[PDB]
Amino acid sequence: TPLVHVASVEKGRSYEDFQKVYNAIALKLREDDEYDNYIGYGPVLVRLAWHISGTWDKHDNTGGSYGGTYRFKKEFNDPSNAGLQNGFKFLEPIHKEFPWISSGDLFSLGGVTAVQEMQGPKIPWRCGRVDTPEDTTPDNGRLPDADKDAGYVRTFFQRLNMNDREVVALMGAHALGKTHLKNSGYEGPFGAANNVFTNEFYLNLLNEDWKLEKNDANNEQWDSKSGYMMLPTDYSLIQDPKYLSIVKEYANDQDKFFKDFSKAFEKLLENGITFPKDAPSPFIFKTLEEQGL
Numbered sequence: 001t002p003l004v005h006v007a008s009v010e011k012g013r014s015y016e017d018f019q020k021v022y023n024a025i026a027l028k029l030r031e032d033d034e035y036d037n038y039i040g041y042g043p044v045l046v047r048l049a050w051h052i053s054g055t056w057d058k059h060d061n062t063g064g065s066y067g068g069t070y071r072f073k074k075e076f077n078d079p080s081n082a083g084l085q086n087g088f089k090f091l092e093p094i095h096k097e098f099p100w101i102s103s104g105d106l107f108s109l110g111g112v113t114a115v116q117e118m119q120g121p122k123i124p125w126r127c128g129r130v131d132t133p134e135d136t137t138p139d140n141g142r143l144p145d146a147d148k149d150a151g152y153v154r155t156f157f158q159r160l161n162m163n164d165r166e167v168v169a170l171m172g173a174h175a176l177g178k179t180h181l182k183n184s185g186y187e188g189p190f191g192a193a194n195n196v197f198t199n200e201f202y203l204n205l206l207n208e209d210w211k212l213e214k215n216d217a218n219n220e221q222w223d224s225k226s227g228y229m230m231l232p233t234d235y236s237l238i239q240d241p242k243y244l245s246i247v248k249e250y251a252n253d254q255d256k257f258f259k260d261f262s263k264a265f266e267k268l269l270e271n272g273i274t275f276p277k278d279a280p281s282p283f284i285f286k287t288l289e290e291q292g293l
């Protein structure tokens with residue numbers, strides 16, 4: 001019925017092996033700091049880990065991070081994936097240095113690394129994704145649109161098994177990076193510290209004086225006087241009563257947010273995967289800084 005995707009550890013690799021993949025990504029983040037006006041690749045890597053996992057469909061178990069399908073042209077050229085080719089090119093040299101790691105493992109680990117190196121919470125990670133054939137490649141149109149409301153959001157997230165708390169936690173990733181007119185038809189940074197992971201998203205949502213305006217792509221976006229932007233979908237988080245109390249909580253307790261994000265991020269990344277009982281426990285990578293590197 002529903003595919004079964006069983007996690008299979010890359011033959012003979014242990015934690016120390018993954019730790020080295022992480023340090024390599026981390027060191028390259030540190031070094032290629034000029035990308036996107038000095039934002040770095042942090043933000044784009046997180047978005048890549050989310051896009052490759054976001055095609056999951058809890059109904060027939062297709063999509064999700066398992067198969068590393070993003071590697072195939074059909075998924076690669078998904079209009080909703082515009083701009084991700086940048087994170088991809090960043091990871092190639094790494095892949096070339098550690099060719100035994102599957103695609104799905106590499107892509108998702110990049111997401112984890114970026115978060116943790118951007119001072120976010122530690123995200124437990126599990127290895128075992130296995131590259132699947134080009135034909136397991138999900139059709140385009142599974143990633144969400146930005147021009148909708150709270151109802152759309154709720155509904156969408158339901159396909160990935162996420163509840164309200166999880167949706168709002170995960171959305172605080174929008175404190176990172178920015179929108180790029182040529183990629184999405186939206187333009188502008190989401191906040192001020194755009195490569196440091198904090199509860200900024202929530203605070204901005206509550207505290208700014210937002211103006212609905214149309215952009216040069218002729219789409220509507222919420223614009224703040226401080227020069228930030230919010231998508232309709234971000235904004236809807238304060239339109240929905242259920243969502244808004246969660247926003248409030250997060251605005252109030254970065255710690256709770258960090259706890260919730262961590263869980264929800266991991267869940268997103270592990271959707272559709274079966275972990276045999278003998279599978280190693282989730283790894284918790286040290287940062288460069290914890291290693292004194």
Ligand code: HEM
Pocket residue numbers: 043044046047050082083144145146153170171173174176177178179180181182183184185186231233
């Ligand atoms: C309704 C759900 C979502 C929608 C509609 C959405 C849409 C977008 C759009 C349109 C962009 C701008 C891309 C560009 O023009 O370069 C963006 C950026 C971004 N998204 Fe989301 N997103 C959603 C949820 C998420 C989630 C769940 C995460 C991670 C948990 C995430 C992480 C990011 C990051 C970090 C960026 C900034 C990327 C950069 O600076 O290149 N987003 N998102």
